[PDB]
Amino acid sequence: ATKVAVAGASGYAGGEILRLLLGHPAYADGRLRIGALTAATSAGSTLGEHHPHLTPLAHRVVEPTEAAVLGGHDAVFLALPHGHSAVLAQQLSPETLIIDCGADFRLTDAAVWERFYGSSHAGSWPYGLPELPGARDQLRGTRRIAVPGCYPTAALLALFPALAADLIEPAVTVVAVSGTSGAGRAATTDLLGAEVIGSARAYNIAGVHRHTPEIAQGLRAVTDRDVSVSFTPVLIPASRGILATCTARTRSPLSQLRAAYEKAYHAEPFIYLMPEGQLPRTGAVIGSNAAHIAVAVDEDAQTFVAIAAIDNLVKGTAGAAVQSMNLALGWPETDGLSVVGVAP
Amino acid sequence: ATKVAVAGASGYAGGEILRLLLGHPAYADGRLRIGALTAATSAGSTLGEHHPHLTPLAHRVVEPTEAAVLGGHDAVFLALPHGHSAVLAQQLSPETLIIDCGADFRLTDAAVWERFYGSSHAGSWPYGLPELPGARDQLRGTRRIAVPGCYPTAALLALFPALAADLIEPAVTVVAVSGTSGAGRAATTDLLGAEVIGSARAYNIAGVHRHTPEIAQGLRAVTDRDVSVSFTPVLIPASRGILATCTARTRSPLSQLRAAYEKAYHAEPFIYLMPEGQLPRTGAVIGSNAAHIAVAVDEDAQTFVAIAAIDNLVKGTAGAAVQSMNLALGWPETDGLSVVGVAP
Amino acid sequence: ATKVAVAGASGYAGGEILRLLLGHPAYADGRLRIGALTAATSAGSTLGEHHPHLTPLAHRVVEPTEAAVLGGHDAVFLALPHGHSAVLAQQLSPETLIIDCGADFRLTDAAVWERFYGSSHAGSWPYGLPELPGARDQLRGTRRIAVPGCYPTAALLALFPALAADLIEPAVTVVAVSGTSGAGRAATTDLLGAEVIGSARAYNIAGVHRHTPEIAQGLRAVTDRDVSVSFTPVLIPASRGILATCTARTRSPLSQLRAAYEKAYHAEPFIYLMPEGQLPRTGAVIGSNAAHIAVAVDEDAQTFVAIAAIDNLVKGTAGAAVQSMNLALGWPETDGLSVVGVAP
Amino acid sequence: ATKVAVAGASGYAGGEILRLLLGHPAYADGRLRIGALTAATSAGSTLGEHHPHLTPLAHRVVEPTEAAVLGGHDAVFLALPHGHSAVLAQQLSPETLIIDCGADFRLTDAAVWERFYGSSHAGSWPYGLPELPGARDQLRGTRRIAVPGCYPTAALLALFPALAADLIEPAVTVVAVSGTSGAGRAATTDLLGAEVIGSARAYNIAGVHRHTPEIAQGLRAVTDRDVSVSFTPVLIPASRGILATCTARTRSPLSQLRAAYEKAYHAEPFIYLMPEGQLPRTGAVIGSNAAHIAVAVDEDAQTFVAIAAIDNLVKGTAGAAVQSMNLALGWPETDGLSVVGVAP
Ligand SMILES: NC(=O)c1ccc[n+]([C@@H]2O[C@H](COP(=O)([O-])OP(=O)(O)OC[C@H]3O[C@@H](n4cnc5c(N)ncnc54)[C@H](OP(=O)(O)O)[C@@H]3O)[C@@H](O)[C@H]2O)c1
Ligand SMILES: NC(=O)c1ccc[n+]([C@@H]2O[C@H](COP(=O)([O-])OP(=O)(O)OC[C@H]3O[C@@H](n4cnc5c(N)ncnc54)[C@H](OP(=O)(O)O)[C@@H]3O)[C@@H](O)[C@H]2O)c1
Ligand SMILES: NC(=O)c1ccc[n+]([C@@H]2O[C@H](COP(=O)([O-])OP(=O)(O)OC[C@H]3O[C@@H](n4cnc5c(N)ncnc54)[C@H](OP(=O)(O)O)[C@@H]3O)[C@@H](O)[C@H]2O)c1
Ligand SMILES: NC(=O)c1ccc[n+]([C@@H]2O[C@H](COP(=O)([O-])OP(=O)(O)OC[C@H]3O[C@@H](n4cnc5c(N)ncnc54)[C@H](OP(=O)(O)O)[C@@H]3O)[C@@H](O)[C@H]2O)c1
């Protein structure tokens, strides 16, 4: 049996990993066991005090996040803020499958990392976005996964097919709305319900958001040209969901762009291209590992437009982690990962 | 193979039955086929124009609700407004399993039906609330099921253990908040998003709500005493969820009340009694077939208080329908019905 | 010119006092000036860092909450958590008008205060609910005001006319839903947007909420029967608004109850009795100082039902404070207090 | 006295005009009277059945929308869907002040109008955006006003100072989120609460939205350069508010751009440039006629970023209508128009 530990089990990403594992077929038949659940200060509390939706695990006592407690598990999810997985990965048995939700091993340019995160670059692990060209093969049998950030997942799925086929200019604009669970459950006044309800605001604008270079990195993997990214995130009064509106200049006809998206995504089970006349909505993908995508051309503005909707906690985090865990373990990639949303 | 038709497939309850069937183990192993999907004016359209979250069924063409279309199915869900079940059930075989989400066959007193619904009584079918004393036995192998209303489900789960144990007075008060999907997807000005968002309102107050006699009927099934029900529903700015606050006068001690609930619900897989110090929240049960329940005693007011949270679309209707379907077909009662909520 | 200080200016109640003062006619004609704005940890920041909606005051620097800073003001609003007004009030001049939004001076029974607040009783000041029988006369020319809690404001307006006329039994039940701004802006995980959005929950149930004795106290002021209060508050996903559903057994006819509410409220400018066939909604009173009320009789359950909607930050706090301020200073009671809501 | 009629009084824009008129100083001192309130199918009903927040007018009976009904009024607000206004305005006296919230008289190019609205071009009236260069001159003493659309108001305020100073390129991108009251109150399934709540969706993308040429026309008024507009609107689960994220290739450093916005807006009472390190939020402007603006430069992407927040119903429509009314009547422009938002 694959014994699984979750570090950061009391946070939003850790809770969603547990939700997905509880529903995974390997948990049903005993090939996957849910072992130690650890955190920082929540140690000693029961899991139900943080995740009342996870009633089968509510009685579990949260433990300290120490190598000894996380030891003895074949797979370890790290659902912590960036800064801990580098040292934590080193203390663990190297045979252990380590799936890091944080950013520590995402970036391939050490100088880019130091500019945006202000610490020593730890390195890079296989990127947990299996639909990216080349990425799936690197995850088969791997023992190290860097799960993508939520906004990059939406932006890259929206944009890479057009850019890989040289059908748009490499200067892209991304304005993405997001529910507030993407910010984590650490209490701040700016994330308070009364503040968030009934309001929308852009934040970390004009290149300072740390996902900007992660989008750039993913796009550079499919083109020769110099990539620039204008990325604006906008917080909206929903708990989950990302709707990324992505634009770039183009002179290619719509029919060519449509065919490029059909070719890239016809055999990708989690990507759904909208029928003609329909557009994505975050409500349709909530609680699923799906991305819903539509493309169009603004002829007057000579601008390509791609819309992508994902659940930030599933395809944008925990579902990507479980998807990559499946590939790493040699299990069917779709195990435990529904494409069906929970709407309305 | 059990072939299933869903009448009212384009509505909220029909869409949620379909979501649950797609995840049901009998669908996965071919024991259950999803057959004809019918409606009224939406006949001729594709299901994706109504339920974009159900992408595996998006291509299905909605058919007319006609006995010729519903025939040849081993099971037929009726997810229609009340008024059509009697005729449709007359036209289907007695061996066909018919599961009615509407009210037509819920009430056992013709005079009560006439007073609250203004029409002749159709009769009554086994009530699809398996947790009620005596209900499960009536549902095993049955071919006719009347699924309960969503508010009675919450209220009856909150109250019947105390009342059946003679630990409270039979004059009960229920004030229940509900998300707006409980009203259905028919477009009215009062259900418009701009109206509902940011606002709460009680409606159909002081005994005019048709679920009042349904609550009373379920309580009279566990006591000979003179039941009265003060029921106030309150619409709140959520899409799903019912939180029923239920009260009754008592002089019994809390210890005896908690023991009554633990005895009644210990072996009930969908009922979760909150640990000491915790209270239910609708967010914890969304997308699950669970009910979360806590009880307390207000000594100064000599008042018993029971709180119950359910998802109105799952345990409040479509999950109850599939739960009853499982019992009717001799399948494991929990098949396809998770207790794990989709939160936050 | 009346110089006004606000202690706790960085909080929700303090911000709403300032919003109302900015729109008060005395502010427009110079009779009223907004002086010191004080807090605790927030001292040293600008007001716009806390209340970006108050742009005319955004540049104001928040000052420490000290007697020296607060001195030299004709009126001082205290918008602090309970337990600080006694120590702060005793350091101001007795001729200073002190208006306390907290509970410190609301309760008239020292033993009840100690039970529910766990500290020594400070005493009691004129209660800032002018519509209560006898209350308005105690406020005229006063220099001490204890502003009521938000739930008691709704429950008392819903219930006192029936109880004062001996038309209902004195055992009352109140189930009130509230937007999340009633909990204050101090950051807790339970108040985070992702948690409160899409979810509802009762809290502090079965008589432990500190507003239970405050409701009982107001009701005891209109009757000599023994009062008891079953009070359940319910957090819902809105930022503002309280909808109180209040019930009591009755043997009086509806016409008599209706007449008692018309008599009590016909001359009350902030109280609006719903037209026949209409019911209150919190969205209709947001941003106004109004209460919208309807009453009914559940004949089958021999139960009176009263529904009251207020804005918890206006008539439930800062509007009541400004309303009482007007009375204390001899200004027209409605000055700066609109009855028109901001909907949708 | 100025007698005012409102056509389309039962809708969202008409109701918000009435809210502002009720708080206008001319209404308080008798110089403005609220006369005929008209609609289509809601004629015969009372206004309270549509706008329960407008309790001082709740008793008013809605009348049919006929030119003879609207005659005899010194000022007429038209808050109807496109069409109607032209036919109605032709039958009204040329000495009547007509303020049209619809699009009929906004556009100055008949071929553009035909292409996006599919009807004959009625002409064009002075555009009701007083902050636009040259606009205030045209509004003084005018008897005809075309009020701008909500999204163009936000986009033009965000972009025109940069473009007028030739500091950015004329190919602009706008992605704007909007609360659902922008869609009007006509009941459709796509606007119902359960659909809108918890979901976000772009609509009318890639140049098909009718506000695209309106944005382009406003920008052409400040540059003789060729303007292109990529405009994407996104519906979010709020009832009010527009947050426009506007980008363009930059040819300038932030200091020059900030200075240009300071110069353009320091005089403007409704336009608030955010302090250093603060960004707009729609919650801060709800219920006010304010727009909050911030600008930035993404150096790595060489992209100018401008964020604008307004209330879609106030500065986006009814507030702009009343603002232009003041100017046309020779009244103080800010009369009845607060800059203070109703937050949280
Ligand atoms: N949330 C998303 O949508 C999303 C999407 C993509 C990627 N991610 C990434 O996933 C990671 C988790 O984010 P989140 O949203 O889940 O935040 P969160 O809800 O606040 O949870 C953070 C968890 O990490 C634990 N923790 C914090 N510091 C710790 C320390 N020194 N040692 C051990 N445990 C510690 C916390 O334990 P305590 O309870 O004791 O504090 C908590 O359980 C982040 O790195 C994020 O970048 C998140
Ligand atoms: N929604 C809940 O939370 C809930 C909970 C418990 C019980 N129920 C009960 O389940 C039933 C469905 O409620 P709902 O929320 O799903 O309403 P809904 O969303 O508005 O949809 C109703 C469905 O019934 C179809 N329909 C209406 N009239 C029909 C007719 N003459 N012939 C054939 N089909 C017709 C409609 O087809 P078209 O699309 O063509 O109109 C539609 O698909 C109700 O009786 C309700 O009491 C609902
Ligand atoms: N909010 C409502 O709906 C409502 C309704 C009715 C009555 N009330 C009552 O009004 C009062 C304020 O509630 P709230 O919702 O506004 O809470 P809040 O949003 O969290 O703000 C509390 C304010 O009090 C300040 N403060 C806290 N401790 C202080 C201390 N030792 N010394 C000086 N200032 C201190 C805080 O300043 P810092 O920012 O520096 O911490 C803050 O500005 C409460 O007593 C409440 O019971 C509230
Ligand atoms: N809503 C916004 O945020 C916004 C912002 C900027 C500009 N505008 C513009 O303002 C106008 C009103 O939009 P809205 O949001 O208020 O829509 P709405 O909420 O649906 O109301 C539309 C109003 O127009 C009336 N009406 C409809 N058809 C009519 C007809 N043949 N004859 C007479 N009256 C008719 C309606 O009366 P009945 O009740 O009888 O149907 C109703 O009162 C639109 O042109 C819009 O472009 C709106």
Numbering used by the authors:
A (entry chain D), B (entry chain A), C (entry chain B), D (entry chain C): 9 to 352
Lines from the paper:
The L-arginine biosynthesis pathway consists of eight enzymes that catalyse the conversion of L-glutamate to L-arginine, appears to be attractive target for anti-Tuberculosis (TB) drug discovery. The arginine biosynthesis pathway consists of eight different enzymes ([Fig fig1]) all considered to be essential for *M. tuberculosis* growth *in vitro*. In this work, the ligandability of four enzymes of the pathway ArgB, ArgC, ArgD and ArgF is explored using a fragment-based approach. In conclusion, using a fragment-based approach, we have discovered inhibitors that bind to novel sites in ArgB and ArgF and to the active sites of ArgC and ArgD, which in case of ArgB show on target activity against *M. tuberculosis*.
(A) X-ray crystal structure of ArgC apoenzyme superposed with the NAPD bound holoenzyme. Binding of NAPD causes significant structural changes in two loops of the protein that move from a closed to open conformation ([Fig fig2]). The apoenzyme ArgC with 5% DMSO was found to have a melting temperature of 67.7 °C. While 1 mM NADP^+^ gave a small average positive thermal shift of ~0.6 °C and 1 mM NADPH produced an average negative thermal shift of −0.9 °C across all DSF runs performed.
